Amino acid sequence: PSTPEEKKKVLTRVRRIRGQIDALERSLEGDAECRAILQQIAAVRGAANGLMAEVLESHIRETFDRNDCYSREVSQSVDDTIELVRAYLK
Amino acid sequence: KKVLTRVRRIRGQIDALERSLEGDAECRAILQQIAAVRGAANGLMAEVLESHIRETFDRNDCYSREVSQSVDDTIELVRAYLK
Amino acid sequence: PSTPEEKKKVLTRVRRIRGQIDALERSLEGDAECRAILQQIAAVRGAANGLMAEVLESHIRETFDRNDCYSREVSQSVDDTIELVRAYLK
Amino acid sequence: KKVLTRVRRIRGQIDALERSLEGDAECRAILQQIAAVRGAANGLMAEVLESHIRETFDRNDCYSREVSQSVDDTIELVRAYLK
């Protein structure tokens, strides 16, 4: 993030991830079944990966823009690149 | 246990990332740290799995040098895949 | 596998994986799109994982049996364990 | 184009696995080798993505040291996640 607007959304998501980690401690200290925990942990990893893709997409786009290089073909390269990352970096 | 040890390290990573963001760090650094959170979610999953597996086979009243390896190799395999 | 029957099923699956690696090789010899290649590689990995579970499950089962220790609860534990491995080792 | 480099070495692992089985190796050893097949496929994926990412951002006629690093950093993540 470079824009203060991007700073805000990421902080939101990051906080929401601390929100998911709270419920995991809450569940760990309590009466949780390993299958419910593993699921909570998996959703943490899902959330991180979600955000990683959103930061990456945003970073790549800003790089091309500072370089006066943003066009529709560049923009779609990024679309293509992020679909792959979303699908294969887990 | 060794599990909460890891839940804190995760919380540790998220608060630093929350602060990286507050302290306006460079984008490479934000990505570096989100990837590291994911890596620790995998490491934590490798503990909780290791717990449930260790615990499920002591529970079955089958002790043996041979059964212990079988359970070490299962754990070694989990560790390879999740690190 | 210790059993001469289980050696055969596994050896099929391994060959079926060679068959997938040859199709992948065809697709790099000739030219298919870069997303169809990724999909092929993921399918190889899905096949390896798939077999890693089948072998793991059989190995654990044999260990309890060989120790005169096989019951239904031991059997369902292995069911519970493999379902997790299938779901979380990728 | 060092994709064949790896597709070969992966075929190398499958045949050794086929030998292990024909040659009555330990059940522990089969699992070790199947995990390494999976590990190789991930490495293969980390090359094929690297090919595509590089190829896709040179094709945009946008050169600059700052753009090169953004692409290095992308490729670093790809490597971190897959090995």
Author numbering:
A (entry chain C), C (entry chain D): 2 to 91
B (entry chain B), D (entry chain A): 9 to 91
Publication text:
Like other members of the CsoR/RcnR family, EcFrmR oligomerizes to form a disc-like tetramer, constructed from two homodimers, each of which forms one face of the disc. Each subunit consists of three helices (α1, residues 2–30; α2, residues 35–68; and α3, residues 73–91), linked by two short loops (L1, residues 31–34; and L2, residues 69–72), that are arranged as a flattened S-shape. The formaldehyde-exposed EcFrmR tetramer is asymmetric. One face of the tetramer (A/B face) is comprised of an unmodified homodimer with electron density visible for residues Lys9-Lys91 of both polypeptides with a disordered N-terminal region (residues Pro2-Lys8). In contrast to the A/B face, clear electron density is present for residues Pro2-Lys8 of both subunits on the A′/B′ face, resulting in an ordered extension to the N-terminal region of α1. The Pro2′-N atom is located within ~2.5 Å of the Cys35-SG atom of the corresponding subunit on the opposite face of the tetramer. There is extra density between these two atomic positions, indicating the presence of the formaldehyde cross-link, and a methylene bridge (-CH2-), as indicated by the LC-MS data, has been modeled at this location. The crystal structure of EcFrmR reveals both the free and signal-triggered states of the protein. Whilst the position of α3 is similar on both faces of the tetramer, there is a translational movement of α1 and α2 on the A′/B′ face, which slide across the equivalent helices on the opposite face by ~1.5 α-helical turns in response to formation of the methylene bridge. In addition, the C-terminal half of α2 twists and buckles towards α3, which alters the packing of these two helices, generating a 10° off-parallel angle between α3 and α2. This movement changes the overall size and shape of the A′/B′ face, which expands and elongates by ~10 Å on the diagonal in response to formaldehyde (Animation S1).
